[PDB]
Amino acid sequence: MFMINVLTLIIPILLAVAFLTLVERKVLGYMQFRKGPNVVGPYGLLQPIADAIKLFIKEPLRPATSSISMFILAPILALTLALTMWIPLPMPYPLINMNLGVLFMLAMSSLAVYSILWSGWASNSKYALIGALRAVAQTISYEVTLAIILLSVLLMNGSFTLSTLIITQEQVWLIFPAWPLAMMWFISTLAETNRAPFDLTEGESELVSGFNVEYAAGPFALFFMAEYANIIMMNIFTTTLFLGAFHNPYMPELYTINFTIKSLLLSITFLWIRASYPRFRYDQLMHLLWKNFLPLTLALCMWHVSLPILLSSIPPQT
Amino acid sequence: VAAFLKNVWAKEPVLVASFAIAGLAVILPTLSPYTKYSLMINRATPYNYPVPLRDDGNMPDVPSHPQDPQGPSLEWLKRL
Amino acid sequence: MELLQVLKRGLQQVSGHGGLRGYLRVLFRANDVRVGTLVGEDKYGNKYYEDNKQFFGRHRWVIYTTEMNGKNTFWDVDGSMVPPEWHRWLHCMTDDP
Amino acid sequence: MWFEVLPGIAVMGVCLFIPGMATARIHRFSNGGREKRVAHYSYQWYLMERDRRVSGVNRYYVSKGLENID
Amino acid sequence: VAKLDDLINWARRSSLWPMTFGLACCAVEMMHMAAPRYDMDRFGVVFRASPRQSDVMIVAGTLTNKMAPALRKVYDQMPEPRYVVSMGSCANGGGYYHYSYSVVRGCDRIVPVDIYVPGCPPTAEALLYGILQLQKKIKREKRLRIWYRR
Amino acid sequence: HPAAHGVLRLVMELSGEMVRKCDPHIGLLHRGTEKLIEYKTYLQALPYFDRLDYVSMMCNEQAYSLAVEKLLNIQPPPRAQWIRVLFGEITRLLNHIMAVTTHALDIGAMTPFFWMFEEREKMFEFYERVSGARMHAAYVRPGGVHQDLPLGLMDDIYEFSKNFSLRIDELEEMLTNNRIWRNRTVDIGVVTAEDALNYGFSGVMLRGSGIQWDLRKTQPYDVYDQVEFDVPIGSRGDCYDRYLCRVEEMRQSIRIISQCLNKMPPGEIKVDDAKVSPPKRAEMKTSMESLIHHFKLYTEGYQVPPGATYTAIEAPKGEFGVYLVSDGSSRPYRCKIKAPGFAHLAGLDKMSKGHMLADVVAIIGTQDIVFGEVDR
Amino acid sequence: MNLMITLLTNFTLATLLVTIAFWLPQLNVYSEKTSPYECGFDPMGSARLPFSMKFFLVAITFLLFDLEIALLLPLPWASQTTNLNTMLTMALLLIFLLAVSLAYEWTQKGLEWTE
Amino acid sequence: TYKYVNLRMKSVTDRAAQTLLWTELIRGLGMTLSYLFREPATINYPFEKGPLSPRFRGEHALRRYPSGEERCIACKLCEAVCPAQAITIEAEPRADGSRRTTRYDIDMTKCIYCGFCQEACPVDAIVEGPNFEFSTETHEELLYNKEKLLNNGDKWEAEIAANIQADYLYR
Ligand SMILES: CCCCCCCCCCCCCCCCCC(=O)OC[C@H](COP(=O)([O-])OCC[N+](C)(C)C)OC(=O)CCCCCCCCCCCCCCCCC
Ligand code: SF4
Ligand code: SF4
Ligand code: SF4
């Protein structure tokens, strides 16, 4: 009966992506002193359905100069990669109980850029090439910091399993002994998912649309849902990493309620962040992450290496 | 050295903070009192099987029962 | 506790629109559920309301009819169904209805 | 006013509640009322295979107690 | 096929995506329409800069002789279905600069225009009325019924 | 392109991604106003000036009216002068709101655009109440203004000017102290005073470079010498100093608006010489001379003595001038429009040397450029 | 096995959407909708010209720092080792080598940009 | 007369704490959240309309006397003052000898809506009326003849007369 579990994992996150678009437009209007979409349905509840049907009855409009192989291969790979790393998340019991789920998340997150590169190179245009180059620079910036953030936060967990991450929260949150690393991790999740002020690929003022500027409707919606599943899942991962809740084996309802509310609040905070700051230049992206973030996280990494030896607090690996 | 420290704290505080954390992480475990406690905590974890030994009749330390007072105890971690 | 007053205002907005049927009708048609002082009505069926407690621009509004000049206007409400006297009143050109 | 976003976002809450809960409920069906036996190393797998080999129905979740022996 | 026609007409008319094609005074009037006072985004109308992901195009300003190939290429790169909304008087019939040597006398000569919005500049409420008229024009489309009859 | 102002063709030689040669190809909005002007009389050529700079409409009207009144050797009544100065300051606030908010949108902060476009709509409503059109008023005419202010408008102006400084403070908190906004404009687009004057720059650019020059303080017009206000002066030539200068110019515009509202004198709104200004509709239908003058003014147009003049006003973008040459007939012989945007886009090549492409779009944003004015 | 089933189901759902997006609606193509997008004008040359990219050393040293990460990554299980002094000393040594490489990059003008 | 914009351990520690803990970013976020909790200024179009003025320049109309007889007397001042040359007038005396018009065409795609004709008319015949919601679908529908202008005048007389009564003393 794993098929039913897989379907119930993969369909409601797509529905969550659609209603994330709804509340995205609503809240993003609301801090701009205007209302959101509320004409189509009662408080605009039918906006995602109209958006989804509208993109799928348009014309795909494949370009002549585009190499059709990677042009048709990039969005499906993007949607699959945004979908395939949801499994090791404990919810409170994960789909697949992998001992090294952090490594799986890291490797499938490294794979997620390849759809952007193949969509940039497959379409023959200068804007797609510039978007691919900026995505490459964004990956250069964020990977070498994000790996060390995850390792140094994970050093008190004792193992790479995400199931044992819920055990460590039973006394106190790990955001209290690792609040600077929490700031580093939040900026890194801002940078990875390509959300403002770290967008730099789907630019409106710099480029037209960047990596998918030649992508018409149908294939374009896959990148949209992939990015929104990415941000929802990344906020769920941050919630599990730093603000893990109280788990009771006899009632999973408590933990589902708690992490759902916490991840929803973190996504609202992400929406709050994404439209209050100017967009960064991509030359200042590695003038910050390679210059200010890296020495600080090296110092904190060696501090978290030498800290359980200091206090005699070596965590168990099991 | 105060003027130079004030200058680097005014220009880039991140480097000063990083070097302070690095120096603390270098010099504090060499002054820690619980490092040997970590040593015995790691050494006392029973990973593999504690196989017994043959008897020639002359051993004052090893016991014949796990509950015998002879042999090493683990009271220090129980109290801590 | 002021939140109980907000819930009271919500239930009075539910009750004052003729009930749940009128509440759902105005919700699906006008996308608004505010009650107001009925200024009047015209010969076609356009009911013109006002409420001076709202801010400027939202202090005068109109609920359109359901059948004007033969067409079904339950969903295809147009901005040019206002007679000239009510056109003068509605766009805030004078204070005299 | 502002609280009008509070309906729609609530729907997203349901969209963040239906998956994970379902997995837990699925874990309360295929495992005979208990949780799924989390296997992480070779000895946990050996114990689970021991339950599978002793249950006689080729199901590990059918746990037999001290009443099985005489 | 009558009800399926009613569905896809509702999906296209409630998620119109215009493109950022302004040229003159009338572009500033469009930006004034997109202000919180009138709030285009409440109608399912969100600005998208790329022609490949846009539904309609509102030509705001004066279309000169140096601009006709650009407008023609931008219109030709939009995916079907596409609608063009003329705006102001410059894009309607030339308007003030109708007799000039370097102004196209109405943008109908370059692109097929669906909705004519008159003004100089037209008021943002009138522009919202024109967009609602375009939505009502989309609503009464009869694609699948005509396909079934043919 | 959203960062482009609708009509622009920047061809750049990207050396990887930095610019070595940038060339603005323009003329996509060349309507040819200066040929259509000479085929129309002065009253008919007045609304042509509303559409050159379509964020600074009343200032262009004031420049054209000042040129025609200097040629006609007539001056408006003082109430008309105070009305012109008040609506020119409202126009300056309009232009500065549009320029700052569009620059912040082109850099990436998209909230103050929606925050102050409702205030821009409020001033559009003020234009609606005073002239009858939301944007193209055609209100300032040679001889003063066209109509008197309606009853109850000035209380609305006072209330809006009272409540607008909080919005200015909100914007200045949201952008000035932001580190991301700062780091885009620390040392970008630096210009020197010698290259400011030699490249024909006027207005904020000069005040960005420390040059102390303002046409409202050195060569004043109608009542600007009777109003006390400050002039911001930059110190580095970057875009940051120009943005700060624009914000301070908004604050001084509020100050001038308060001084205007506390000092409006009673009187008439047109020049009482009926051979230039049209007569009132009450006395047109009773007096024969007024009917004859109305007929010939709205059919032929008042004659202007022959000669050439070049007047210049302090437009919100800089110095807006017109070279008007009249041959004695009711139509101008040659009307040339000098604009700050032409020289600013000419100096864009020098100001953008050695920067990344995002800094080029920042330099494009930091020049308040309206391309209808640039292409005329 | 379950990972393979999840991968196959995800790929099936992904590739079913594009097929629905392609073969369901009516296609109508000419030789202008397939043209490359250059803001309404013809493209100047092709996009296959070599970019004069300026962060080549940053990409190579990203690779090298990722291999530093690969050396530093099995550190948590080393927390269960007996010889703790050598563990701590050499984890500090490897982090110090990473910092030495970064500091040499900082001093010798490597983190900046060309031209 | 002039001012200098941008000419300005505890302070260094405060700046470093602002760098590390993001004080002014929190301030800007607080102002964003302040604007989240206010009442949005979106008016419910088309059930609500924006404020206007009695001087509003909208749709062209031809008025009439309060006896049924039309107001235009074929004086051709509107087509002589029109800056866009959008007005075409052809006139002849009708059967009773009254100087009237036979053709009065306004090209509304040429008209710039500047109200010179509504102020140059000696008998207040042509009026830039108040209607702004008159968008069409075809280009020829925006090309009014005399019959359409007379129909617009008879349609909107009931508010055009009131607007003229309210505004005529400022002229
Ligand atoms: C995950 C939980 C929630 C997290 C918070 C989420 C809500 C708040 C989000 C705020 C907005 C974030 C996005 C916008 C900003 C993006 C840019 C950015 O972050 O730039 C980073 C900025 C960039 O700095 P900058 O932009 O000022 O750079 C200027 C640099 N100089 C001065 C050289 C010219 O800061 C850093 O890079 C610093 C890294 C974080 C520092 C954390 C310090 C923790 C404490 C250390 C010890 C302190 C005590 C002293 C030593 C004691 C030793 C024993
Ligand atoms: S129609 Fe009028 S407002 Fe619009 S661009 Fe032309 S002159 Fe400007
Ligand atoms: S409003 Fe102006 S442009 Fe229009 S018809 Fe009258 S005079 Fe001509
Ligand atoms: S100005 Fe008036 S009376 Fe004269 S021709 Fe025109 S509409 Fe007729």
Side-chain angles (χ1 to χ4, degrees):
Chain A
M1 238 187 307
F2 208 65
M3 205 34 173
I4 301 181
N5 223 2
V6 161
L7 283 175
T8 50
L9 172 66
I10 66 183
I11 305 162
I13 71 104
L14 280 150
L15 273 295
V17 158
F19 285 92
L20 173 65
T21 67
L22 210 178
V23 306
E24 181 175 30
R25 266 154 73 169
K26 274 204 80 77
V27 179
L28 275 196
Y30 260 109
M31 314 90 53
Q32 288 158 3
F33 208 31
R34 65 175 159 90
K35 264 178 173 48
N38 73 322
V39 162
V40 185
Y43 319 105
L45 278 183
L46 290 199
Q47 186 76 215
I49 312 191
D51 259 343
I53 301 169
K54 193 228 96 168
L55 287 156
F56 293 156
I57 59 189
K58 224 166 157 71
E59 163 175 77
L61 181 138
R62 72 268 219 188
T65 51
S66 64
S67 313
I68 205 70
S69 183
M70 306 159 181
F71 180 78
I72 213 57
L73 217 172
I76 35 177
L77 181 125
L79 171 73
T80 295
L81 280 172
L83 255 297
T84 192
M85 82 185 41
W86 268 78
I87 38 178
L89 281 166
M91 259 173 313
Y93 305 146
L95 259 302
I96 309 192
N97 232 326
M98 25 195 58
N99 263 319
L100 305 188
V102 166
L103 259 80
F104 179 73
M105 283 230 173
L106 287 199
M108 300 325 88
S109 272
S110 280
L111 202 36
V113 76
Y114 257 68
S115 181
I116 296 119
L117 327 164
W118 290 350
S119 85
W121 187 86
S123 66
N124 197 11
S125 284
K126 281 127 162 152
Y127 283 126
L129 254 296
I130 296 164
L133 264 287
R134 294 175 115 141
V136 160
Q138 203 172 10
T139 323
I140 300 312
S141 64
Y142 95 91
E143 247 320 290
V144 305
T145 87
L146 170 139
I148 282 311
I149 310 327
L150 197 31
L151 181 130
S152 310
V153 165
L154 193 173
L155 262 190
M156 41 205 78
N157 193 12
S159 76
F160 285 105
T161 316
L162 275 144
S163 296
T164 200
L165 191 73
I166 216 181
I167 299 308
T168 325
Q169 340 277 331
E170 230 170 52
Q171 286 288 97
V172 85
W173 297 336
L174 317 92
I175 204 183
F176 279 129
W179 72 271
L181 301 196
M183 314 212 107
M184 322 295 317
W185 176 249
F186 208 65
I187 306 305
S188 182
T189 55
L190 261 173
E192 158 191 352
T193 319
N194 322 312
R195 200 63 168 253
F198 306 92
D199 207 341
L200 276 304
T201 36
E202 197 163 17
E204 284 315 275
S205 163
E206 252 314 289
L207 322 163
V208 189
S209 174
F211 63 96
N212 47 4
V213 67
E214 219 154 312
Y215 264 82
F220 167 66
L222 293 204
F223 286 96
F224 215 47
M225 312 175 145
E227 210 262 13
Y228 285 156
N230 257 10
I231 188 179
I232 279 182
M233 171 255 298
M234 209 61 35
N235 278 225
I236 278 187
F237 184 48
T238 300
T239 291
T240 318
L241 259 177
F242 288 95
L243 308 172
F246 176 57
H247 181 27
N248 217 14
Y250 287 90
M251 291 215 168
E253 321 166 20
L254 264 75
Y255 184 74
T256 48
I257 279 156
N258 227 357
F259 95 106
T260 281
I261 288 182
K262 271 160 186 166
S263 72
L264 176 128
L265 262 283
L266 275 192
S267 68
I268 287 306
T269 309
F270 216 126
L271 255 179
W272 183 19
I273 285 299
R274 79 128 285 178
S276 67
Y277 294 140
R279 274 221 321 271
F280 261 125
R281 304 198 278 155
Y282 86 124
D283 81 331
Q284 298 158 351
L285 219 63
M286 319 94 59
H287 267 317
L288 155 70
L289 261 54
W290 274 90
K291 222 149 202 153
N292 312 117
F293 270 29
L294 205 45
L296 186 63
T297 187
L298 283 192
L300 287 151
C301 197
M302 80 208 310
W303 182 248
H304 276 121
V305 162
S306 67
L307 188 88
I309 300 176
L310 196 81
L311 326 169
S312 75
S313 315
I314 298 286
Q317 88 153 291
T318 301
Chain B
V1 85
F4 165 71
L5 189 128
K6 173 162 169 123
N7 205 1
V8 278
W9 186 239
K11 293 182 279 182
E12 181 146 10
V14 195
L15 295 195
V16 182
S18 306
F19 268 79
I21 293 157
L24 259 45
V26 152
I27 78 164
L28 275 166
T30 84
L31 258 52
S32 49
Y34 291 97
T35 308
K36 48 169 291 184
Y37 272 36
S38 266
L39 262 172
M40 321 162 228
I41 277 160
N42 250 339
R43 206 135 43 95
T45 295
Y47 274 114
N48 39 47
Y49 196 91
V51 65
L53 314 96
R54 273 291 274 275
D55 45 341
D56 58 341
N58 277 316
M59 47 280 277
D61 271 20
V62 304
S64 294
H65 217 275
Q67 295 160 357
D68 292 346
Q70 308 106 40
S73 167
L74 172 43
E75 64 165 301
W76 52 271
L77 154 57
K78 225 189 298 160
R79 313 320 201 290
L80 260 178
Chain C
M1 192 46 257
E2 186 87 340
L3 180 56
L4 272 83
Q5 308 304 314
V6 182
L7 311 193
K8 278 291 292 312
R9 287 202 283 277
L11 65 97
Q12 287 212 28
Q13 271 172 36
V14 165
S15 161
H17 274 303
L20 191 63
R21 182 166 292 274
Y23 191 88
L24 288 183
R25 267 184 54 185
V26 78
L27 186 68
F28 284 140
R29 281 197 60 231
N31 309 111
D32 219 29
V33 278
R34 300 195 327 273
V35 286
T37 297
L38 188 140
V39 157
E41 83 150 290
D42 88 9
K43 73 196 287 279
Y44 318 98
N46 296 343
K47 305 174 132 64
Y48 299 86
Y49 304 86
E50 80 177 3
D51 193 15
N52 268 10
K53 287 179 196 333
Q54 300 295 323
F55 70 99
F56 203 72
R58 259 193 174 171
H59 62 295
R60 290 172 181 163
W61 71 85
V62 54
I63 282 303
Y64 295 138
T65 168
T66 57
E67 173 208 18
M68 175 211 218
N69 293 322
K71 64 175 255 197
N72 177 33
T73 83
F74 191 70
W75 297 113
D76 302 312
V77 278
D78 211 58
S80 196
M81 329 203 320
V82 199
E85 54 270 13
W86 290 110
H87 196 115
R88 196 188 140 81
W89 172 79
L90 185 68
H91 291 65
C92 328
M93 317 220 176
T94 206
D95 278 289
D96 315 331
Chain D
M1 311 305 88
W2 59 281
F3 46 79
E4 275 170 33
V5 48
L6 288 176
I9 190 185
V11 186
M12 202 221 288
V14 190
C15 293
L16 286 177
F17 197 117
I18 281 164
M21 181 35 88
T23 83
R25 289 203 72 84
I26 290 304
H27 289 188
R28 262 129 204 82
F29 207 70
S30 297
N31 299 294
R34 296 110 200 267
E35 297 171 356
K36 206 165 83 45
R37 178 88 51 85
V38 176
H40 271 193
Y41 324 83
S42 82
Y43 165 106
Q44 313 226 11
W45 174 255
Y46 185 51
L47 285 192
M48 199 255 270
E49 284 299 308
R50 195 226 199 281
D51 316 314
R52 195 188 62 82
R53 283 161 320 136
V54 71
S55 53
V57 203
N58 207 327
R59 349 189 83 84
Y60 76 100
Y61 45 84
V62 191
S63 278
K64 272 179 254 184
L66 91 168
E67 72 295 340
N68 198 38
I69 59 181
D70 43 346
Chain E
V1 303
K3 289 275 73 182
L4 172 43
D5 159 57
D6 261 6
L7 202 173
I8 73 154
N9 288 330
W10 169 71
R12 276 166 184 174
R13 85 163 163 274
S14 39
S15 175
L16 289 171
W17 289 353
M19 71 165 318
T20 84
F21 213 170
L23 285 91
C25 317
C26 275
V28 183
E29 201 73 23
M30 255 157 40
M31 298 334 166
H32 253 276
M33 182 266 257
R37 173 62 69 81
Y38 303 112
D39 186 30
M40 72 166 23
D41 195 79
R42 93 191 274 271
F43 297 94
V45 182
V46 46
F47 256 125
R48 294 298 294 156
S50 322
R52 320 265 207 181
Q53 46 210 266
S54 315
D55 249 343
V56 300
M57 166 181 35
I58 301 138
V59 194
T62 310
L63 169 73
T64 63
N65 280 333
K66 218 167 176 178
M67 201 54 189
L71 170 62
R72 193 51 215 187
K73 189 151 182 168
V74 165
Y75 170 69
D76 260 301
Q77 285 160 359
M78 297 213 293
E80 303 242 343
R82 49 210 172 168
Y83 311 97
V84 184
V85 173
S86 175
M87 215 188 115
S89 290
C90 288
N92 268 336
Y96 214 169
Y97 317 96
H98 178 90
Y99 290 108
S100 169
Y101 63 89
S102 87
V103 165
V104 183
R105 293 154 191 86
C107 78
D108 308 6
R109 301 171 172 254
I110 307 299
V111 290
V113 157
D114 213 319
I115 286 297
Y116 294 90
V117 182
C120 178
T123 322
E125 319 160 18
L127 206 141
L128 225 62
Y129 182 57
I131 275 176
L132 289 180
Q133 197 90 350
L134 176 64
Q135 276 191 348
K136 293 216 283 305
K137 184 249 180 179
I138 295 174
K139 177 174 183 179
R140 66 157 191 256
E141 258 174 32
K142 210 133 178 236
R143 293 158 166 277
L144 277 98
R145 263 158 151 276
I146 287 293
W147 171 79
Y148 199 47
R149 297 310 113 95
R150 95 170 61 210
Chain F
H1 216 291
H5 301 109
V7 281
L8 190 41
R9 192 184 184 178
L10 247 59
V11 285
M12 29 201 166
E13 301 305 359
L14 291 179
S15 169
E17 258 212 325
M18 276 156 35
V19 286
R20 302 277 198 85
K21 172 201 260 163
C22 189
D23 214 3
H25 278 236
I26 64 164
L28 309 154
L29 214 75
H30 175 75
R31 272 86 55 101
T33 305
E34 305 158 350
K35 193 161 188 56
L36 294 147
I37 285 176
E38 66 171 277
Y39 285 109
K40 288 167 206 301
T41 87
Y42 291 83
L43 172 58
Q44 317 180 11
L46 165 73
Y48 265 137
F49 276 64
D50 262 326
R51 295 131 164 84
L52 306 161
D53 194 3
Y54 43 70
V55 284
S56 301
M57 29 215 82
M58 301 283 246
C59 275
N60 308 143
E61 293 182 6
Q62 191 175 2
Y64 181 76
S65 292
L66 276 168
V68 177
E69 284 161 2
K70 191 185 281 186
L71 273 169
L72 285 182
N73 231 27
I74 60 149
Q75 52 152 335
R79 181 179 184 85
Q81 300 188 349
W82 280 99
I83 286 170
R84 282 217 292 235
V85 161
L86 158 74
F87 277 93
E89 293 295 324
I90 272 177
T91 280
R92 189 173 314 271
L93 286 175
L94 286 179
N95 161 264
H96 284 330
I97 283 171
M98 172 100 200
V100 163
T101 37
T102 321
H103 184 39
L105 172 89
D106 286 334
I107 276 176
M110 43 190 256
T111 53
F113 183 87
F114 301 100
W115 288 5
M116 304 229 194
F117 260 50
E118 44 157 39
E119 313 310 281
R120 204 165 192 275
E121 221 284 324
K122 256 186 271 182
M123 306 156 116
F124 270 18
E125 290 191 14
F126 295 151
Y127 276 21
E128 188 35 278
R129 296 187 66 200
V130 77
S131 75
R134 261 198 36 187
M135 227 179 164
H136 294 321
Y139 182 78
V140 159
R141 305 212 188 166
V145 292
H146 167 238
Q147 242 162 357
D148 211 351
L149 323 169
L151 278 170
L153 161 71
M154 281 215 278
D155 287 338
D156 289 351
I157 309 288
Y158 159 70
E159 218 79 22
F160 159 73
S161 149
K162 183 175 58 59
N163 312 347
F164 189 61
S165 176
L166 192 46
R167 317 279 94 78
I168 292 184
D169 281 321
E170 277 178 351
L171 169 53
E172 205 173 13
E173 197 268 2
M174 211 38 188
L175 296 194
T176 289
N177 288 323
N178 206 342
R179 184 61 31 61
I180 313 182
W181 176 267
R182 277 184 65 91
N183 289 332
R184 303 292 294 266
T185 60
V186 201
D187 278 327
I188 319 276
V190 196
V191 81
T192 58
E194 294 82 70
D195 287 320
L197 308 179
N198 267 340
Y199 272 85
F201 288 159
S202 41
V204 197
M205 308 285 185
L206 307 186
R207 294 187 296 280
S209 153
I211 275 288
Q212 307 184 7
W213 173 256
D214 217 55
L215 279 168
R216 301 176 292 186
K217 291 274 178 177
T218 55
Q219 300 167 6
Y221 41 96
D222 306 327
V223 85
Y224 263 109
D225 39 338
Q226 272 142 262
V227 154
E228 185 83 28
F229 72 107
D230 278 355
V231 170
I233 292 302
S235 300
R236 218 185 287 105
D238 41 7
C239 317
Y240 196 54
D241 283 2
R242 285 181 278 267
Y243 145 82
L244 278 173
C245 277
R246 289 190 170 103
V247 170
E248 193 55 43
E249 207 175 5
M250 283 187 345
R251 270 181 174 91
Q252 300 310 310
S253 287
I254 278 186
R255 184 189 187 184
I256 297 158
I257 277 175
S258 93
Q259 299 256 323
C260 269
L261 290 208
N262 277 318
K263 265 175 215 51
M264 201 95 68
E268 76 272 11
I269 48 56
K270 287 193 202 75
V271 165
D272 216 38
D273 195 355
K275 301 181 189 284
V276 177
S277 84
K280 303 184 177 295
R281 299 187 68 86
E283 49 181 341
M284 166 197 99
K285 316 193 179 187
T286 316
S287 299
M288 184 65 197
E289 267 99 346
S290 284
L291 182 63
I292 293 176
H293 289 70
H294 170 89
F295 196 98
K296 295 297 295 179
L297 270 185
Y298 285 100
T299 50
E300 157 162 350
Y302 45 88
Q303 283 88 0
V304 170
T309 181
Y310 165 62
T311 192
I313 67 131
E314 185 76 25
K317 292 178 175 46
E319 165 181 355
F320 203 96
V322 288
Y323 182 53
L324 208 85
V325 196
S326 52
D327 66 329
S329 62
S330 63
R331 293 163 292 166
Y333 190 78
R334 176 83 165 98
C335 170
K336 184 55 157 48
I337 309 150
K338 177 250 174 300
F342 212 79
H344 292 183
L345 217 59
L348 155 76
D349 309 42
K350 213 268 289 179
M351 286 175 53
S352 155
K353 216 164 59 62
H355 294 287
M356 310 273 196
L357 152 72
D359 288 320
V360 199
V361 316
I363 288 155
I364 283 296
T366 199
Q367 324 168 349
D368 180 29
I369 303 303
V370 161
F371 282 85
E373 148 195 303
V374 164
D375 310 357
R376 306 98 142 83
Chain G
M1 182 65 157
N2 299 325
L3 192 40
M4 222 78 68
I5 303 153
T6 308
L7 280 194
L8 188 87
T9 302
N10 264 353
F11 205 41
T12 280
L13 171 152
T15 204
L16 199 131
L17 267 182
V18 279
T19 286
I20 271 286
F22 260 83
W23 309 117
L24 159 84
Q26 159 76 44
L27 57 138
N28 217 25
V29 283
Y30 334 115
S31 178
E32 260 286 341
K33 311 160 105 209
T34 64
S35 64
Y37 174 67
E38 207 60 42
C39 299
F41 294 130
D42 43 8
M44 271 55 58
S46 193
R48 303 304 203 257
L49 197 150
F51 254 101
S52 180
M53 171 284 258
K54 312 167 176 181
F55 43 88
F56 31 82
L57 80 168
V58 197
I60 284 187
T61 50
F62 150 79
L63 176 141
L64 296 169
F65 272 29
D66 211 341
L67 281 293
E68 310 285 90
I69 296 329
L71 271 283
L72 213 71
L73 206 147
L75 219 32
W77 297 301
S79 285
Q80 327 292 315
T81 207
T82 304
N83 332 111
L84 220 68
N85 196 286
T86 314
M87 191 256 268
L88 172 69
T89 314
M90 267 165 99
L92 257 59
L93 181 65
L94 203 162
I95 290 193
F96 177 70
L97 286 187
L98 210 152
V100 154
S101 154
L102 189 58
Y104 166 90
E105 282 216 21
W106 207 320
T107 46
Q108 303 293 329
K109 280 87 206 145
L111 293 182
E112 291 109 31
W113 284 55
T114 81
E115 296 181 288
Chain H
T1 317
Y2 76 104
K3 58 163 73 179
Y4 285 107
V5 280
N6 208 8
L7 210 68
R8 64 191 51 270
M9 186 43 109
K10 204 43 52 163
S11 292
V12 181
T13 319
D14 273 6
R15 278 196 283 268
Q18 183 192 359
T19 284
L20 300 194
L21 268 275
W22 310 332
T23 298
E24 199 72 290
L25 296 189
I26 284 285
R27 277 263 297 269
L29 283 166
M31 204 158 324
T32 319
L33 181 153
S34 296
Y35 263 60
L36 158 69
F37 276 83
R38 307 203 200 194
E39 265 54 78
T42 294
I43 45 179
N44 187 17
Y45 203 77
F47 304 91
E48 309 226 37
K49 309 277 160 71
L52 278 178
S53 158
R55 312 187 184 185
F56 174 58
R57 308 211 271 252
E59 193 169 353
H60 279 289
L62 267 185
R63 292 181 76 219
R64 273 158 171 251
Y65 273 103
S67 57
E69 192 261 357
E70 87 180 13
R71 268 179 171 266
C72 175
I73 71 136
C75 88
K76 300 183 187 63
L77 253 71
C78 51
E79 82 164 359
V81 86
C82 184
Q85 300 205 7
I87 305 182
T88 319
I89 316 179
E90 182 204 306
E92 99 174 5
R94 51 184 198 195
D96 62 340
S98 50
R99 183 186 166 112
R100 300 294 143 182
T101 48
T102 48
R103 159 216 286 282
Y104 193 57
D105 286 338
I106 300 190
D107 198 352
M108 302 275 317
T109 60
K110 276 183 191 167
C111 165
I112 76 172
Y113 306 89
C114 86
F116 285 171
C117 56
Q118 92 155 354
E119 88 185 9
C121 187
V123 291
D124 297 344
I126 177 77
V127 160
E128 203 74 280
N131 196 10
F132 62 97
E133 32 200 350
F134 61 109
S135 64
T136 60
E137 290 196 349
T138 42
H139 198 178
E140 31 273 50
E141 210 198 332
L142 274 169
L143 263 69
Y144 294 155
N145 55 349
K146 195 193 169 173
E147 316 290 329
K148 182 60 180 182
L149 291 168
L150 274 177
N151 272 332
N152 273 359
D154 297 10
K155 196 174 177 192
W156 296 93
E157 190 77 25
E159 161 186 331
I160 278 172
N163 275 336
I164 284 185
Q165 190 80 13
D167 191 52
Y168 85 112
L169 279 178
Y170 294 98
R171 311 185 191 172

